[PDB]
Amino acid sequence: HKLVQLLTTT
Amino acid sequence: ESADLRALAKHLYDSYIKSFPLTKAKARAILTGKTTDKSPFVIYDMNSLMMGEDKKEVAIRIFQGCQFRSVEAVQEITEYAKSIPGFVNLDLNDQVTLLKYGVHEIIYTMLASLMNKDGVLISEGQGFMTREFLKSLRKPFGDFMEPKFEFAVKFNALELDDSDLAIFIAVIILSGDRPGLLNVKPIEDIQDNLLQALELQLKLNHPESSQLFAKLLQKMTDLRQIVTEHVQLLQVIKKTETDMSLHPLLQEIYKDLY
Numbered sequence A: 001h002k003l004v005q006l007l008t009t010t
Numbered sequence B: 001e002s003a004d005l006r007a008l009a010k011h012l013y014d015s016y017i018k019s020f021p022l023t024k025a026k027a028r029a030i031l032t033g034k035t036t037d038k039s040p041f042v043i044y045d046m047n048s049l050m051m052g053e054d055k056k057e058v059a060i061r062i063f064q065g066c067q068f069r070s071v072e073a074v075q076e077i078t079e080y081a082k083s084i085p086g087f088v089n090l091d092l093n094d095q096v097t098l099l100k101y102g103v104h105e106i107i108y109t110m111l112a113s114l115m116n117k118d119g120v121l122i123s124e125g126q127g128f129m130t131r132e133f134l135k136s137l138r139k140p141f142g143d144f145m146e147p148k149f150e151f152a153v154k155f156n157a158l159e160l161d162d163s164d165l166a167i168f169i170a171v172i173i174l175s176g177d178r179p180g181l182l183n184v185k186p187i188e189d190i191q192d193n194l195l196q197a198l199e200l201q202l203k204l205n206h207p208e209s210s211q212l213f214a215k216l217l218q219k220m221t222d223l224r225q226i227v228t229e230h231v232q233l234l235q236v237i238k239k240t241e242t243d244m245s246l247h248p249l250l251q252e253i254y255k256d257l258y
């Protein structure tokens, strides 16, 4: 969730 | 093939330099005083901690402080994982899972880089907190760091450098056996390639180090036990030490972990 944000950030 | 494995090794090292501002190379320069900049301030007691706190009980403040660095390190490790070839193409839920189970194993790996037998570098290497001071903290906070020091001393005896660590770290993140993975195969395939790259790296970088590769792989399993102990300590704190919470990011990593 916060992990998803970090993972998909560019 | 050999050239590809070396280019993989180098790609991982470059990514590691881009992701982690404070390397083992720099850390050791600081710990051995082979640097031009100021000696780090030593935190060895309560009022020593006071003076350094410039540049709510003691044990809680330290534990709250750890968390801010922990979440910063989670961000760094995530950025590094996104540079491992094949990783961003995995099902996103599997990336989350890989990250969730892998992240603290990596934090403790890299923390060993900032440790010697007497203490640990904090705040980007500007402070040094003695192992003895951390051991002095009241139950259960005084039990947090000691297993990490015990691991770090033995881990550091292997004398891995940043280039070794970049591959080591990638191998751990790409563990096909994390609980609840949807697609194990493409993870094992990537890991198999990274292991080949690690084996070649250790042979070329440490030709005389007996069974280094096998020794390293073992440490990967030892890290899980360290995380296990940390998590059970956190569960005690959750149950019995209630006035101070856990950063939301860390709650998310730890929620339903194992």
Ligand SMILES: CCO[C@@H](Cc1ccc2c(ccn2Cc2nc(-c3ccccc3Cl)oc2C)c1)C(=O)O
Pocket: B061, B062, B063, B064, B065, B066, B067, B069, B070, B071, B073, B107, B111, B120, B122, B123, B129, B134, B145, B230, B250
């Ligand atoms: C209790 C939180 O534990 C972390 C893991 C953890 C523990 C310890 C960690 C880090 C990162 C650096 N350290 C070493 C450390 N960093 C600090 C610190 C860092 C900044 C300010 C003040 C302090 Cl006392 O203290 C200590 C012991 C991460 C977690 O579960 O996410």
